[PDB]
Design a protein around this ligand. Structure first.
Ligand SMILES: CN1C(=O)N2Cc3c(c4cc(OCCN5CCOCC5)ccc4n3Cc3ccc(C(=O)NO)cc3)[C@@](C)(C2)C1=O
Ligand SMILES: [K+]
Ligand SMILES: [K+]
Ligand SMILES: [Zn+2]
Length: 353
């Protein structure tokens, strides 16, 4: 059984100054309508959304950050603009805090459904996204770190050191997720992302391959940075083959969360990559071999409405047990990237030797 969570109320978060801003309310309604069209929706167990509580938010966020975001609820447009502008790439409306709570609470109910054994795996069609949000700050369309929160939520109902793998295949680095877990050996963070030697958002060397984790978390942060323009299925499949899956198997996660942005998709105007719906299906299918199939796919970014609809629906079809669809040599710089990661992580993972 595959679970699915979607709630129309998460459409209420909007940019009142620019209704064409790419992080659109209709990102989630289009993905949901596509699951209906492909007859995937009726094959899933529907999990209800709920609000995250402030206590749950404190699993990862400071009380000052929660408080500041919550206060936005009762702001006039001018102050919404001023507050959003204190962050990098944030717009806020009166509904934003509520929607951020719903995105987190939806993922919690999904992780609970998996861990109580109501469902084997699940998909969360949620917004606003999460992975740029830091303990103390909002960033990059993200208010609270939904995936990071979900990992802590899962630990709070099982065991504190429950081994959680987060695979972040959004085209951007999840700086917030990396930082939250940087000293933590219970949460393995693996990100693939466009880097371009720092020219690609969020423009920090924190995304480079030599950032391997700190203290007891050393070896538990795996950055796979792409340089040198468009990448697609071959490069993604090669990174999963050489790096993601051997490290993951060695870690032996008890729960997999996917920070599943679909902005590395063919057609995305922000990502500039060419990962196909069939590619994402193969990535999902591989991750399903981990943690006895306990996989929660969480929407992050992805801005071409058709691309994200087809791609996320393909992932759900895999979680449901459908056969992987049918699938070149790698761009030279992709080989260089993979080999850099391998060199950086060989000291920590015997499977890479
Ligand atoms: C690549 N790239 C970027 O990532 N940098 C951040 C950025 C960019 C950008 C451009 C935008 O409008 C361009 C005009 N047109 C839009 C329609 O298409 C045609 C162009 C709007 C928001 C923007 N943001 C903010 C942002 C974007 C994605 C995530 C996300 O998914 N992370 O997981 C997080 C934050 C920039 C300039 C820089 C940028 O170009
Ligand atoms: K990523
Ligand atoms: K970590
Ligand atoms: Zn992104």
């Amino acid at each position: 059984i595959t679970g699915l969570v979607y709630d129309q109320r998460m459409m209420l978060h909007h940019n009142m100054w620019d209704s064409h801003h790419p992080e659109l309310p209709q990102r989630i309604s289009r993905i949901f309508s596509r699951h209906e069209e492909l007859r995937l929706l009726s094959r899933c167990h529907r999990i209800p959304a709920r609000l995250a509580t402030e206590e749950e938010l404190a699993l990862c966020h400071s009380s000052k950050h929660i408080s500041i975001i919550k206060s936005s609820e009762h702001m006039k447009p001018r102050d919404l603009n001023r507050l959003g502008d204190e962050y990098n790439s944030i717009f806020i409306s009166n509904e934003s805090y509520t929607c951020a709570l719903l995105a987190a609470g939806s993922c919690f109910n999904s992780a609970q459904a998996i861990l109580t054994g109501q469902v084997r795996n699940a998909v969360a069609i949620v917004r606003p996204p999460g992975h740029h949000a830091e303990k103390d700050t909002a960033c990059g369309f993200c208010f609270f770190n939904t995936a990071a929160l979900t990992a802590r939520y899962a630990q709070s109902i099982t065991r504190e050191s429950l081994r959680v793998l987060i695979v972040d295949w959004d085209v951007h680095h999840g700086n917030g997720t990396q930082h939250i877990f940087e000293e933590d050996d219970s949460v393995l963070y693996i990100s693939l992302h466009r880097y371009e030697d720092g020219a690609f958002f969020p423009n920090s060397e924190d995304a480079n391959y030599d950032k391997v984790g700190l203290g007891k978390g050393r070896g538990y942060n795996v950055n796979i940075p792409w340089n040198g323009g468009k990448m697609g299925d071959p490069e993604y499949m090669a990174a999963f083959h050489h790096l993601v899956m051997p490290i993951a198997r060695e870690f032996a996660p008890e729960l997999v969360l996917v920070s599943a942005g679909f902005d590395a998709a063919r057609g995305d105007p922000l990502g500039g990559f060419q990962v196909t719906p069939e590619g994402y299906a193969h990535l999902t299918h591989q991750l399903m071999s981990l943690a006895a199939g306990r996989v929660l796919i969480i929407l992050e970014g992805g801005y071409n409405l058709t691309s994200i609809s087809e791609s996320m629906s393909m992932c759900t079809s895999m979680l449901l047990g459908d056969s992987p669809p049918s699938l070149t040599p790698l761009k030279t710089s992709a080989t260089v990237s993979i080999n850099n990661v391998l060199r950086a992580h060989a000291p920590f993972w015997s499977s890479l030797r």
